[PDB]
Amino acid sequence: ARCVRLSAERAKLLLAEVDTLLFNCDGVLWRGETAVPGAPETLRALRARGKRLGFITNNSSKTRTAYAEKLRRLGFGGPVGPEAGLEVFGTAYCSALYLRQRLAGVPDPKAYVLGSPALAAELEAVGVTSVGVGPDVLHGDGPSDWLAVPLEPDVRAVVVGFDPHFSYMKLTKAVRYLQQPDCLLVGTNMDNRLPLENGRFIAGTGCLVRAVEMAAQRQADIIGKPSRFIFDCVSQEYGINPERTVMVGDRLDTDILLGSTCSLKTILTLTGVSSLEDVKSNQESDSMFKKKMVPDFYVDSIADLLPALQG
Amino acid sequence: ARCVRLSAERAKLLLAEVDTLLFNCDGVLWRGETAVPGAPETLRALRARGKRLGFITNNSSKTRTAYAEKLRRLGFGGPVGPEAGLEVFGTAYCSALYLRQRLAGVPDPKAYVLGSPALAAELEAVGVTSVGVGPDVLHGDGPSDWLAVPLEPDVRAVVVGFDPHFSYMKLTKAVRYLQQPDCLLVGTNMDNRLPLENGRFIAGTGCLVRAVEMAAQRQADIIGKPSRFIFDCVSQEYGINPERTVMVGDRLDTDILLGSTCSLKTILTLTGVSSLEDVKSNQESDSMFKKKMVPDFYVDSIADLLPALQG
Numbered sequence: 236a237r238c239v240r241l242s243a244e245r246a247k248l249l250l251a252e253v254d255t256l257l258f259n260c261d262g263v264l265w266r267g268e269t270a271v272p273g274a275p276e277t278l279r280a281l282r283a284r285g286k287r288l289g290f291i292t293n294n295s296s297k298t299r300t301a302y303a304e305k306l307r308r309l310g311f312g313g314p315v316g317p318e319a320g321l322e323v324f325g326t327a328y329c330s331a332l333y334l335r336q337r338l339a340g341v342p343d344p345k346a347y348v349l350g351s352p353a354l355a356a357e358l359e360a361v362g363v364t365s366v367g368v369g370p371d372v373l374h375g376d377g378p379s380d381w382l383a384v385p386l387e388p389d390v391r392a393v394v395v396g397f398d399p400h401f402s403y404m405k406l407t408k409a410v411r412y413l414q415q416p417d418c419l420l421v422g423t424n425m426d427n428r429l430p431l432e433n434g435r436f437i438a439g440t441g442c443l444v445r446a447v448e449m450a451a452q453r454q455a456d457i458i459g460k461p462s463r464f465i466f467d468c469v470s471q472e473y474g475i476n477p478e479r480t481v482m483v484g485d486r487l488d489t490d491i492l493l494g495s496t497c498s499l500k501t502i503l504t505l506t507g508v509s510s511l512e513d514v515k516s517n518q519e520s521d522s523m524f525k526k527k528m529v530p531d532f533y534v535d536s537i538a539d540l541l542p543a544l545q546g
Numbered sequence: 547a548r549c550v551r552l553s554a555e556r557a558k559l560l561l562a563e564v565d566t567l568l569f570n571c572d573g574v575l576w577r578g579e580t581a582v583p584g585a586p587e588t589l590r591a592l593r594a595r596g597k598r599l600g601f602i603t604n605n606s607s608k609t610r611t612a613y614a615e616k617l618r619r620l621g622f623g624g625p626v627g628p629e630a631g632l633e634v635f636g637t638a639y640c641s642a643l644y645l646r647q648r649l650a651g652v653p654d655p656k657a658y659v660l661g662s663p664a665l666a667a668e669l670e671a672v673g674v675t676s677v678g679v680g681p682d683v684l685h686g687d688g689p690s691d692w693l694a695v696p697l698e699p700d701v702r703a704v705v706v707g708f709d710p711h712f713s714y715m716k717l718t719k720a721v722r723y724l725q726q727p728d729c730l731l732v733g734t735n736m737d738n739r740l741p742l743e744n745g746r747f748i749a750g751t752g753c754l755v756r757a758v759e760m761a762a763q764r765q766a767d768i769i770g771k772p773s774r775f776i777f778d779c780v781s782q783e784y785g786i787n788p789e790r791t792v793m794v795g796d797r798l799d800t801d802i803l804l805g806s807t808c809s810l811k812t813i814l815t816l817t818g819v820s821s822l823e824d825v826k827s828n829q830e831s832d833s834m835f836k837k838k839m840v841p842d843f844y845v846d847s848i849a850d851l852l853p854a855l856q857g
């Protein structure tokens with residue numbers, strides 16, 4: 236955990252020692268719809284050497300198939316056909332898995348999803364009916380009118396994911412549903428800001444999840460990184476061996492901390508949000524938790540692996 | 547800080563040593579439009595005894611003048627006419643004063659207010675123009691469209707107050723405005739829940755302010771209780787003497803903590819949010835901050851002061 240630059244020799248040693256590599260799609264492989272220069276060639280070379288490539292993302296907007304299509308379109312060489320989805324693990328699919336297990340044996344389970352269409356679709360495939368996907372503008376002169384709005388009959392969970400239609404009405408409805416102790420609170424991810432191309436960014440799902448949490452005085456179960464649950468899903472379907480697996484990430488609090496908590500080796504790409512200066516601040520601090528989110532190796536871009544892989 | 551019940555004897559002695567009593571309007575004096583039973587008579591008796599009564603509230607929805615009208619309407623016996631407003635101190639008015647200080651020397655001052663009409667009105671009286679009050683529904687299929695929406699040219703502050711129209715578009719616009727370093731971030735209050743009559747509650751301004759804070763990675767300046775600023779505003783016009791002043795409140799984290807930090811004596815009314823068990827948790831805990839939010843006296847309702855006052 237010394238944030239060593241992964242030079243070609245160091246990279247060759249690490250690559251020989253690891254037969255699986257896990258990546259964060261946003262900020263490592265690609266930004267916006269534009270690939271990080273050289274990243275596609277790097278991942279294709281890694282597949283050529285026989286290394287298993289897996290993808291972990293905190294984005295609830297896209298399904299497994301959609302993310303796989305993006306990776307193939309941009310030349311990261313995923314398997315073609317339906318099998319592609321198996322390679323990518325995202326908060327939407329993992330949220331569906333969490334609700335499948337937790338609400339197992341519940342008849343015709345339904346949930347209030349303050350989230351994207353893909354999240355609702357993944358839940359539907361799991362069998363969880365979804366309500367609340369879409370706009371919910373506020374109507375009423377005062378609080379009583381807002382609290383009077385009708386609610387769906389059987390809602391056993393609230394899923395907070397990226398919802399551009401998020402409103403105070405949705406927050407009030409979420410609180411009302413969550414007043415029942417049985418009702419679960421699920422947060423897709425806890426990212427404060429999410430990066431976009433050209434150094435632009437938009438507010439992160441975490442802002443919504445913290446708003447709902449505070450309003451209901453409940454602590455949500457966060458499916459996404461850095462929670463061990465997303466790693467457990469990957470481990471259930473990939474059979475990950477922590478000693479022989481690497482996590483490539485751009486965000487210290489989510490990706491790198493996932494690696495540290497789950498005993499995976501960590502590579503930090505500076506293409507994305509986090510910076511070497513942030514690592515230095517965490518290193519200097521005496522807090523052990525801050526020390527956890529310190530990467531084993533750092534690369535300017537994933538493309539810096541190409542010299543070793545082009546061997 | 548032993549949370550002793552305010553018996554009639556204790557009340558008479560305490561009233562003898564204190565010549566000013568400050569109250570929280572919501573949850574102590576009244577809930578909704580329904581007054582706490584006997585409270586109007588208590589405050590009227592305090593006026594008759596000569597005790598100076600002042601009001602501090604975290605609600606940005608209501609103007610100073612409107613709160614005064616509520617006080618006379620419900621029989622709490624404030625001075626009639628314009629001077630009524632002098633008695634009430636609220637987050638809207640205090641926020642306007644804060645912006646008067648910070649935006650002093652600014653031509654045509656403007657702010658993006660995620661808030662009520664009353665908040666904008668108080669700002670307007672101070673001279674600060676308001677933008678964004680009202681619905682701003684999100685339209686557009688993706689992030690680029692949302693960030694392309696035009697913004698007003700001159701915004702030197704963003705004020706996050708209770709906004710029933712809060713939406714992701716308003717959060718994005720607030721983030722964009724706060725990206726300029728000069729732009730200030732002001733939060734009217736930081737309450738997670740606000741109480742309503744009938745034991746129901748809705749989400750608080752604090753949830754919205756925390757969402758904006760996280761999205762902008764900025765620390766908002768919180769005007770409302772327990773911030774020292776609201777007490778300074780009260781003291782500017784009242785000349786508060788801590789030895790002779792009491793704070794009557796229903797919420798430990800806001801009212802009682804203001805009393806402790808500003809060295810005012812504290813009475814807890816159980817009519818509102820906080821409960822004796824919460825006080826017990828703070829007393830038992832070894833955290834010093836929890837010990838700060840422990841009331842000196844506790845009264846079931848302010849009406850239990852009437853026996854001492856009817857003397």
Ligand SMILES: O=C(Nc1ccccc1C(=O)O)c1ccc(Oc2ccc(C(=O)Nc3ccccc3C(=O)O)cc2)cc1
Pocket residue numbers: 261293294295296350351352368369370397398399424426429430439440441687688689
């Ligand atoms: O919810 C969306 N749509 C709809 C909802 C209801 C009805 C119709 C639609 C309709 O698109 O017709 C939606 C969701 C997302 C949208 O863009 C985004 C694309 C990508 C991301 C993203 O990088 N996400 C993250 C990445 C890293 C870490 C966290 C996140 C996160 O999202 O928390 C975000 C938004 C557009 C429409």
Ligand SMILES: O=C(Nc1ccccc1C(=O)O)c1ccc(Oc2ccc(C(=O)Nc3ccccc3C(=O)O)cc2)cc1
Pocket residue numbers: 448449452453454736737738752765766767768771772773799800
């Ligand atoms: O989130 C809160 N609770 C919970 C969340 C999950 C589960 C349980 C609870 C549970 O309280 O059982 C929360 C707690 C307390 C809250 O009041 C507050 C009151 C005042 C302030 C405040 O002025 N703070 C600041 C002061 C000055 C400058 C900046 C700030 C700032 O906060 O930035 C904060 C919270 C609210 C929610």
Ligand SMILES: O=C(Nc1ccccc1C(=O)O)c1ccc(Oc2ccc(C(=O)Nc3ccccc3C(=O)O)cc2)cc1
Pocket residue numbers: 376377378572604605606607661662663679680681708709710735737739740741750751752
């Ligand atoms: O009690 C209230 N507050 C608080 C009390 C204690 C602690 C915290 C808060 C706290 O708000 O954080 C309260 C009272 C009344 C409330 O109804 C409201 C209803 C409507 C609006 C509002 O913007 N309305 C409009 C805005 C734009 C355009 C039109 C309108 C309209 O009403 O036509 C605000 C508050 C909420 C909380």
Ligand SMILES: O=C(Nc1ccccc1C(=O)O)c1ccc(Oc2ccc(C(=O)Nc3ccccc3C(=O)O)cc2)cc1
Pocket residue numbers: 425426427441454455456457461462488759760762763764765
């Ligand atoms: O608040 C954040 N920022 C700032 C705000 C103001 C000023 C400066 C900063 C500034 O980062 O300089 C913030 C930082 C990092 C954030 O990622 C996080 C991701 C996840 C969690 C988290 O609890 N993850 C959970 C996982 C499992 C179980 C429970 C939780 C839970 O959240 O309950 C915290 C931070 C977010 C905001």
Ligand SMILES: [K+]
Pocket residue numbers: 505506507508509510
């Ligand atoms: K960077």
